[PDB]
Design a protein around this ligand. Structure first.
Ligand SMILES: O=c1cc[nH]c(=O)[nH]1
Ligand SMILES: O=c1cc[nH]c(=O)[nH]1
Lengths: 272, 272
């Protein structure tokens, strides 16, 4: 009928934010992939947001879509929020603007003023209206990011919020090699996720659709992997860039080659 | 004082346009690369527009920047407009939303009833404010596109509008293989261009900068290759995305793979 899209960052305070973002003076160019520029958010900036997701750092798919959480992690997160009856009314700022280069990480820089101060201005901007009913952090650094926000002047008012530390969507796969232990560490992730949902269900009193909580099983049921909605992607992008199939990856013979190149690859079935 | 960027298409009437665009029902999926989405424009949509550029079709350098004419062609067009003394005050629009898949030139469909009307839907919108001081078409289908606009109801008001059809900026390289023949067709494009500049310059009464008209020589002065300005690119996009060096190309072993894939590689010098 009509196809929805995220107009982007026209309205203040987001215009100045996207107009005045930090570079090498804050993010170390070797430890952070600043070469790809910053990806700022995913979701609503009009106030209709009820849940805030605090993620960790972008990847190759985010680098093309220019929105965060549009890969596997985001697709698992979508379903997580889908269980809360939340289908679009969300906001998702990543901790770090740029991706960590290695597991060396931003954790070497998690308390750097350049990173924290800027991130907090975004926190303040999305929470200002005060329509956020819950907060869900993805992983450890997201947690300390949310905590570091709360110990600040502007953050103190949000200590009563419904924050919830969550394990990082892809811990299973980055923690493990065999697929047995990965599934084993998937079962433990879903368990902790269920705990968080049980904790958050009562506090989200404005869902997009009223839905009674259906807990995760031992593994990811496909119904619980929801494609990113069109309203999240900028004008024109194709629906294969928000689908169930991977379409972006870094390529190179050595670590240097991989850092400079990305390959976009359209899934089979789009072209006749 | 910092970097700029294109908010996107959030103010009407452009958002509804970007929300209701034509797809396979208008652009033939075999002849057009509908697979990458439509790219809508480049430049100003706030009324500051002075020149309308009607280009032909997007390329790889337009599938990423999401803006049209951001490669060699755009950089030549950029240099062209600099001579009219306008450095930002422009609007750029293509004949086709999607790129042509082949050498034919997507002419077989140059008269569709879904392709043409939409292009005109944009024309009416960009001309609506009535501050457009000049029109420049790039190549044959660009030329025929402007004429097709003029033969319509809403277009009738613009037959008096200063218009110059010029050779498509990449005519030299798409014609021949030898450096010499490309070198031979060097002033044949400029000289023909100089006339259009001579013809429009007096009618471009509101430039961004008072500028002395300098006709083209026989070849492209490096100064006549102007990098695309930041305000044209969406928020966050790295400045290597709009530099003097190419950074995107199609790759594959057969024709099918090549249509599905795109390699982006960052130029040397971005990463220390
Ligand atoms: O943006 C992203 C992408 C993957 N994982 C995250 O935590 N954030
Ligand atoms: O946008 C573009 C890019 C290349 N050539 C064109 O005609 N238009």
């Amino acid at each position: 009928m009509l196809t929805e899209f995220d107009a982007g960052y026209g309205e203040q305070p987001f215009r100045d934010l996207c107009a005045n973002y930090p570079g090498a003076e804050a993010y170390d160019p070797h430890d952070f992939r600043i070469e790809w520029g910053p990806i700022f958010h995913r979701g609503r900036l009009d106030g209709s947001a009820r849940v805030l997701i605090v993620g960790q750092d972008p990847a190759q798919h985010e680098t093309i879509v220019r929105r965060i959480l549009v890969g596997t992690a985001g697709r698992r997160t979508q379903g997580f929020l889908a269980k809360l009856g939340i289908v679009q009314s969300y906001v998702m700022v990543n901790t770090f603007l740029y991706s960590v280069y290695g597991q060396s990480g931003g954790s070497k820089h998690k308390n750097e003023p350049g990173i924290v101060d800027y991130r907090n201005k975004w926190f303040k901007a999305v929470l200002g209206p005060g329509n956020i009913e819950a907060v869900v952090s993805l992983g450890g650094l997201a947690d300390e990011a949310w905590k570091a926000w709360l110990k600040s002047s502007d953050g103190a008012a949000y200590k009563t919020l419904a924050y919830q530390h969550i394990t990082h969507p892809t811990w299973p796969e980055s923690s493990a090699h065999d697929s047995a232990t990965q599934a084993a560490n998937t079962k433990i992730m879903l368990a902790k996720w269920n705990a968080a949902l049980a904790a958050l269900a009562p506090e989200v009193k404005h869902p997009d659709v009223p839905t009674t909580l259906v807990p995760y099983g031992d593994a990811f049921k496909p119904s619980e992997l929801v494609d990113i909605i069109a309203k999240d992607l900028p004008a024109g992008l194709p629906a294969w860039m928000r689908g169930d199939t991977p379409w972006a990856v870094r390529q190179g013979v050595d670590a240097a080659a991989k850092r400079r190149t990305i390959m976009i690859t359209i899934p089979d079935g789009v072209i006749p």
